[PDB]
């Protein structure tokens, strides 16, 4: 048997309110886009911002 | 007289190979287990060939 | 000075060659992309004291003649081009070929050899070479600042650059197939070259015209079955001992004849 590669489940998690205002959550399809100092483009769904 | 014993050795090795393949290919979703079948050989009569 | 002595000498030599091929097969059992060797013999000529079916009289014939053998001669030690087990290494610069074909390699003298072992590296200039400094014939060059190298199911190889959001194709790995795969003469470092025995190679992309497929991250191990080499060795040892016994018997009868 050979591993065909791990696949990730994109099912949305539970939306939990933990106070504060500088935080966003996505309940459906959508990926936040980020750019690093070197200029590359990355995609993440984390809601922590500062 | 090594012919019969060698043939039996190869048959046992093949059976172990099939068993090992079945046990190793566990958890594979689209898998159906295998099974080896054997058959004797005779030249005429009273003359075994493994 | 006795025909039996020469016959037994030929038998001893045949068993010695068989033992040699067994030893070589057992030696490189872990060599990647190694094909085992099998030796095949034949009987030598025959001395006909009485011709079979000779007209012994006007209406009767000999049902069987009188013929004496002259020993055994090894025909050839061919190489069995079976399919080796595909291991897994999770590397980026080694490919396993499943099916038929060979990678072409540009020898330093100028000609080209053919290999079955896929373990590629990069030389100082950046071009893809095999383990041993020999470069592939299409001369695939890997550019600097390469984030990753991918090789598809077919021969196309691409490299992901730092940016551009898209991989860029860098070349293709076409492999060559022969007609008489067992007719290629083998030289060192897992290389083969063609002779009169094998036809002119025809190159093609993997997956077409009977060619194999390329899997990245795997490697083809040798098709040496260590389980049966031992029993073959046992049989070879017994046969060699019996031939030596025949030599000893001939010597004994000669000695007890010359004592007169």
Curated annotation (Swiss-Prot), chain A:
Lineage: superkingdom: Bacteria
Annotated localization: Bacterial flagellum basal body
Record family assignment: Belongs to the flagella basal body rod proteins family.
This protein's name: Flagellar hook protein FlgE
Encoding gene (name): flgE
UniProtKB/Swiss-Prot annotation, chain B:
Taxonomic lineage of the native organism: Bacteria, Pseudomonadati, Pseudomonadota, Gammaproteobacteria, Enterobacterales
Full protein: residues contained: 2 to 51 of 403
Family affiliation: Belongs to the flagella basal body rod proteins family.
Protein name: Flagellar hook protein FlgE
Annotated signal peptide: none
Cellular compartments annotated: Bacterial flagellum basal body
From Swiss-Prot, chain C:
One Pfam family, short name: Flg_bb_rod
The UniProt record lists the keyword Cell wall biogenesis/degradation: no
Domain of life: Bacteria
Keywords: Bacterial flagellum
Subcellular localization, as worded in the UniProt entry: Bacterial flagellum basal body
GO biological process: bacterial-type flagellum-dependent swarming motility
Subunit organization: The basal body constitutes a major portion of the flagellar organelle and consists of four rings (L,P,S, and M) mounted on a central rod. The rod consists of about 26 subunits of FlgG in the distal portion, and FlgB, FlgC and FlgF are thought to build up the proximal portion of the rod with about 6 subunits each.
Family designation: Belongs to the flagella basal body rod proteins family.
Protein name as it appears in the record: Flagellar basal-body rod protein FlgG
Taxonomic source organism: Salmonella typhimurium (strain LT2 / SGSC1412 / ATCC 700720)
The organism's taxonomic lineage, starting at the top: Bacteria, Pseudomonadati, Pseudomonadota, Gammaproteobacteria, Enterobacterales
């Amino acid at each position: 048997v050979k591993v065909a590669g791990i696949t990730q489940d994109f099912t949305d998690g539970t939306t939990t309110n933990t106070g504060r205002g500088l935080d966003v959550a996505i309940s459906q399809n959508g990926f936040f886009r980020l750019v690093d100092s070197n200029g590359s483009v990355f995609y993440s769904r984390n809601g922590q911002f500062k | 007289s090594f012919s019969q014993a060698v043939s039996g050795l190869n048959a046992a090795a093949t059976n172990l190979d099939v068993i090992g393949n079945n046990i190793a290919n566990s958890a594979t979703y689209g898998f159906k287990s295998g099974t080896a079948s054997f058959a004797d050989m005779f030249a005429g009569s009273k003359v075994g060939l493994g | 000075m006795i025909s039996s002595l020469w016959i037994a000498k030929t038998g001893l030599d045949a068993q010695q060659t068989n033992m040699d091929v067994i030893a070589n097969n057992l030696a490189n059992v872990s060599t990647n992309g190694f094909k085992r060797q099998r030796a095949v013999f034949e009987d030598l000529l025959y001395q006909t004291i009485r011709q079979p079916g000779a007209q012994s009289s006007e209406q009767t014939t000999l049902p069987s003649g009188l013929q004496i053998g002259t020993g055994v001669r090894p025909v050839a030690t061919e190489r069995l081009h079976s399919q080796g087990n595909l291991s897994q290494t999770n590397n980026s610069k080694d490919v396993a070929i499943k099916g038929q074909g060979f990678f072409q390699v540009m020898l330093p003298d100028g000609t080209s050899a053919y290999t079955r072992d896929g373990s590629f590296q990069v030389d100082q200039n950046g071009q893809l070479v095999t383990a041993g400094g020999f470069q592939v014939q299409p001369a695939i060059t890997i550019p600097a600042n390469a984030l990753s190298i991918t090789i598809g199911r077919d021969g196309v190889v691409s490299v992901t650059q730092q940016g551009q959001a898209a991989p860029v194709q860098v070349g293709q790995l076409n492999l060559t197939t022969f007609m008489n795969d067992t007719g290629l003469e083998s030289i060192g470092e897992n290389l083969y070259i063609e002779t009169q025995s094998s036809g002119a190679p025809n190159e093609s992309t993997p997956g077409l015209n009977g060619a194999g497929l390329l899997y990245q991250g795997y490697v083809e191990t040798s098709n040496v079955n260590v389980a049966e080499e031992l029993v073959n060795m046992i049989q070879v040892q017994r046969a060699y001992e019996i031939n030596s016994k025949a030599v000893s018997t001939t010597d004994q009868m000669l000695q007890k004849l010359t004592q007169l």
